[PDB]
Scaffold this active site. Structure first.
Site: not given
Ligand SMILES: *C(=O)N1C[C@H](NOS(=O)(=O)O)CC[C@H]1C(=O)NNC(=O)C1CNC1
Ligand SMILES: *C(=O)N1C[C@H](NOS(=O)(=O)O)CC[C@H]1C(=O)NNC(=O)C1CNC1
Ligand SMILES: [Cl-]
Ligand SMILES: [Co+2]
Ligand SMILES: [Co+2]
Ligand SMILES: [Co+2]
Ligand SMILES: [Co+2]
Ligand SMILES: [Co+2]
Ligand SMILES: [Co+2]
Lengths: 243, 243
Positions: A48, A51, A96, A228
């Protein structure tokens, strides 16, 4: 681009029982730092995080007219509830929403996709696989340090797309802002082909500098996804970039 | 533009020993709400809220090249320490650096400034007074309802300046962002002509709607300035716009 190793950041991976890499680029000093030079340069599927470029291309080609244009849900109920509704570029990035981006990819087509990723110098520049999934389970790879190269160009409006496309995408990247900092970033999660990893890449804007970042980490299950950001922020705090 | 009166918001002013108005506009429903209809239409000097149109004009004419151009401190020490340093458009908005915007106004000039404000339908469109201070002690006046009309145009890129200019100024207005909302706004404090009043104008972007806001409140001293945001947010919370 010189990258200094600072292994002290491993404490924040060790502490949260994890393995990965954080890379930081100080734009004013033109100096980089990472806890792991090797993994910093290992190339993975972007998932993702793709993107960002995908949005840029879609906008520049008119596939996406502007950030208010509505992409109507196709009525297929999927695992992630936020996907099952109309979106625009801002909400598609935020949540997302892969199907919206697969449709963009099909409309871009493989020839314009390939040519754009060469212009962007994006990763290994290889789109082999399905036109609408190559960044999930095809031949594209990019490293953390390559994410930063790519993002620095976005920041300065140097990619081979209109300035307008760049500004729109950097608006769609907006993740957090307060009186101390602005973070523009994109997460990702590469499950579909081993090794399962989580990504977060972006930058933090200060009053008088910007710090780019790209991190990836092992992510055997979805349960660690919060790490993350959390680990990236632990490093940013340690380095006195944010409070 | 229709406005409903909702007097219950007066409790947030009263509990803070304050008098003023909050004006909200729901973009999807095209309905307005305010605690005080009269004061909602009462026009005041815009003071630092004038940095929104001033930025737009300065960018459109190329007086400001972009949001990275550095305006070197002129070496004069002023009361507000953050002003005594170099700035760019982002930080000059953030710290509301008057002297940087006075330079803009001088370069724009009276004739172009007046034309632009007519084009914008900005308040009473009257720039009487010094070209470098009329928005602080001259003849221009604007009401909170007029601030909303103007801001709606900006939001939709409908002002008579380039799309680029409008995008850069909306970026520079960025105040707060998180998983629930984004606020783009500008504060002001009109002190040189009575009544002394504080302003906060802008909007809140949600996934599926945008709520515009303009507020002003009596402000005899600077110690109440935080109430501008605090009272507004209490209104926003009461109306379930933000959690
Ligand atoms: C991104 O990497 N995606 C899309 C979505 N993103 O969330 S986040 O990582 O930005 O928070 C979920 C994870 C990931 C995937 O799309 N992975 N899964 C799939 O595409 C499904 C079809 N096989 C599972
Ligand atoms: C804006 O209205 N300004 C500039 C700065 N604003 O900060 S805030 O209101 O956006 O938080 C200070 C207040 C105000 C003034 O400029 N006020 N006064 C003056 O400039 C002169 C009269 N004393 C100096
Ligand atoms: Cl923004
Ligand atoms: Co190439
Ligand atoms: Co090639
Ligand atoms: Co090659
Ligand atoms: Co630049
Ligand atoms: Co209250
Ligand atoms: Co619009």
């Amino acid at each position: 681009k010189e990258w200094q190793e600072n292994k002290s950041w491993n404490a924040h991976f060790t502490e949260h029982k994890s393995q990965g890499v954080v890379v930081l680029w100080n734009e004013n000093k033109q100096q980089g730092f990472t806890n792991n030079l090797k993994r910093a340069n290992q190339a993975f599927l972007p998932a993702s995080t793709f993107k960002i470029p995908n949005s840029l291309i879609a906008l520049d080609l008119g596939v996406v007219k502007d950030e208010h244009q509505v992409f109507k849900w196709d009525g297929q109920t999927r695992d992630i509830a936020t996907w099952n509704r109309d979106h625009n570029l801002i909400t598609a990035m935020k949540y997302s929403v892969v199907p919206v981006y697969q449709e963009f990819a099909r409309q871009i087509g493989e020839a314009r996709m390939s040519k754009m990723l060469h212009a962007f110098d994006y990763g290994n520049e290889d789109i082999s696989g399905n036109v609408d999934s190559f960044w999930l389970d095809g031949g594209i790879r990019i490293s953390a340090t390559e994410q930063i190269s790519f993002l620095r160009k976005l920041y300065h409006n140097k990619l081979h797309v209109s300035e307008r496309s760049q500004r729109i995408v950097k608006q769609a990247m907006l993740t957090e802002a307060n009186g101390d900092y602005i973070i523009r970033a994109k997460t990702g999660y590469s499950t579909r082909i081993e090794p399962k990893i989580g990504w977060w890449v972006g930058w933090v804007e200060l009053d008088d500098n910007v710090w780019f970042f790209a991190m990836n980490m092992d992510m055997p299950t979805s349960d660690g996804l919060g790490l993350r950001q959390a680990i990236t922020k632990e490093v940013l705090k340690q380095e006195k970039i944010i409070p």
